[PDB]
Ligand binder design. Structure first.
Ligand SMILES: Cc1c2c(c(C)c3c1[nH]c1ccc(O)cc13)C(=O)N=CC2
Length: 328
């Protein structure tokens, strides 16, 4: 059937790690004291959790409480194990506690609070300098988790929490994250539509860390071009069409041919024939101050159909685009 694929970096990180590192099913949760925390206000709801601002009454620190509710139960232990594995890594949200909520009777994850600037407001506002700075900060998080054998699989603006005042950034919501095992087939139903990689959209299951690099590319494109989202599909099929209208259909066919992937025949009537566009197409008087040759070359190396051809997180940090950024 399909041609197999392996990550070109950190391929065997988990194979050379003890069972207990990646065997999240066997992880035993360590419970804290739910009475330490007092819920203050509801911040949001997702498909698998309700999120509250709270106070840790033992130290008076503001905190965030994520009360879980998933239908697949092993997912709870997956997120917990991932968070524990990545704790203290650069720009990774810190899991501060795990408590049993008395009302839901489910695990509640307690994180450090981030005084956040809304991305709707914060994008279309960032300077060229600030875009490069924050991209480098996100890359620190991704190289860290990739190096630890973990793919995020839901990189998007909402999951990048920015305290713009202290110029602080954290990658959050590791509930879709998975351990990368070479040759493993994964669920293509991950990530949010506008940020789904071509691999997901063509049903290619043997994907890897490089999925997050496509998502990051979608974020970068939306920032430098001031078009939110950059690839604006009406559904998952139209999502691939929107991509092909930019990257072209010939490189798409080359990609699926390389892996002996067959497109859903549904595309016969909607995909059409599209040339690759030059990135200057998307530059105009209102975004030109955010665009540079370095920015375009960097973006070009992220937004590639072939997941194997994308810059890795580590390579991306090497890019000329980041030369202007002061290295702490
Ligand atoms: C999953 C999730 C959501 C929200 C927030 C603030 C957080 C969140 N995880 C977090 C982790 C730390 C934090 O400071 C805030 C959030 C949120 O505001 N709305 C939906 C989901």
């Amino acid at each position: 059937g399909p041609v197999p694929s392996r990550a070109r970096v950190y391929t065997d990180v988990n194979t050379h790690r003890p069972r207990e590192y990646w065997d999240y099913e066997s992880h035993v949760v360590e419970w804290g004291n739910q009475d330490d925390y007092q819920l203050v206000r509801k911040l949001g709801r997702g498909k698998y959790s309700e999120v509250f601002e709270a106070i840790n009454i033992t130290n008076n620190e503001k905190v965030v409480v994520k009360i879980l509710k998933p239908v697949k139960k092993k997912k709870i232990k997956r997120e917990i194990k991932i968070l524990e594995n990545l704790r203290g890594g650069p720009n990774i949200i810190t899991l501060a506690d795990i408590v049993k909520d008395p009302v839901s009777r489910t695990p509640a994850l307690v994180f450090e609070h981030v005084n956040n600037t809304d991305f709707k407001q914060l994008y279309q506002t960032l300077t060229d300098y600030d875009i490069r700075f924050y991209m480098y900060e996100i890359l620190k998080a991704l190289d860290y988790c990739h190096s630890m054998g973990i793919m995020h699989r839901d990189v998007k603006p909402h999951n990048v929490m920015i305290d713009h005042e202290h110029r602080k950034l954290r990658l959050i919501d590791w509930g879709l994250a998975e351990f990368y095992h070479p040759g493993q087939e994964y669920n293509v139903r991950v990530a949010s539509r506008y940020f789904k990689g071509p691999e997901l959209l063509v049903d290619y299951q043997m994907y890897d860390y490089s999925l997050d690099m496509w998502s990051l590319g979608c974020m970068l494109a939306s920032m430098i071009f001031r078009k939110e989202p950059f690839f604006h599909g009406h559904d998952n099929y139209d999502q691939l069409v929107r991509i092909a209208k930019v990257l072209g259909t010939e490189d798409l066919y080359d990609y699926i041919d390389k892996y002996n992937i067959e497109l859903d025949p549904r595309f016969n009537d909607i995909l059409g024939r599209h040339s690759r566009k030059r990135w200057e197409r998307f530059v105009h008087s209102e975004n030109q101050h955010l665009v540079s040759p370095e920015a375009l070359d960097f973006l070009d190396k992220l937004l590639r159909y072939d997941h194997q051809s994308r810059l890795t997180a580590r390579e991306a940090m090497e890019h000329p685009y980041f030369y202007t950024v002061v290295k702490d």
